[PDB]
Ligand binder design. Structure first.
Ligand SMILES: COc1cc(Nc2ncc3c(n2)N(C(C)C)c2ccccc2C(=O)N3C)ccc1N1CCN(C)CC1
Length: 125
């Protein structure tokens, strides 16, 4: 039930950038969400082999997780905040797609997504 390679956290032919908003997404948004009691399942790529979820990547073709996002922010991999925000949204949606409404992991994603939205509602100038 193999795992694919994790998403890239660097790419030499993609241009880098740093903005106040991206800095905030690392220092305030991600680093605060990371400490939430429901954050742990999202801190690394889904290990389908270890979790006995042999169809996870048969279903999910654009995997994402906060470990990957953190490294991308640390790499200055993103062009802008919206690009990073898209990754968070992909992570949450993957969780909703693979699982069913009401599942424990879905309850965790829903709580984190609310907190995430609360925190990006206002970004620095
Ligand atoms: C035990 O460790 C971990 C276990 C997990 N396990 C995990 N990682 C990801 C899970 C997921 N479980 N769950 C439940 C089962 C929640 C799911 C169960 C069924 C279907 C889907 C999921 C699921 O969607 N996700 C995100 C993730 C990260 C860690 N960490 C290891 C140490 N690392 C420093 C911090 C994070």
């Amino acid at each position: 039930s193999t795992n694919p390679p994790p998403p890239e956290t660097s790419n030499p032919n993609k241009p880098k950038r740093q903005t106040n908003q991206l800095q905030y997404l690392l220092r305030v948004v991600l680093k605060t969400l990371w400490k939430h009691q429901f954050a742990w399942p999202f801190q690394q790529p889904v290990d389908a082999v270890k979790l006995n979820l042999p169809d996870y990547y048969k279903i999910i073709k654009t995997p994402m997780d906060m470990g990957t996002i953190k490294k991308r922010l640390e790499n200055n991999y993103y062009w802008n905040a919206q690009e990073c925000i898209q990754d968070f949204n992909t992570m949450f949606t993957n969780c909703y797609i693979y699982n069913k409404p009401g599942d424990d992991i879905v309850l965790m994603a829903e709580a984190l997504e609310k907190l995430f939205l609360q925190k990006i509602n206002e970004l620095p100038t």
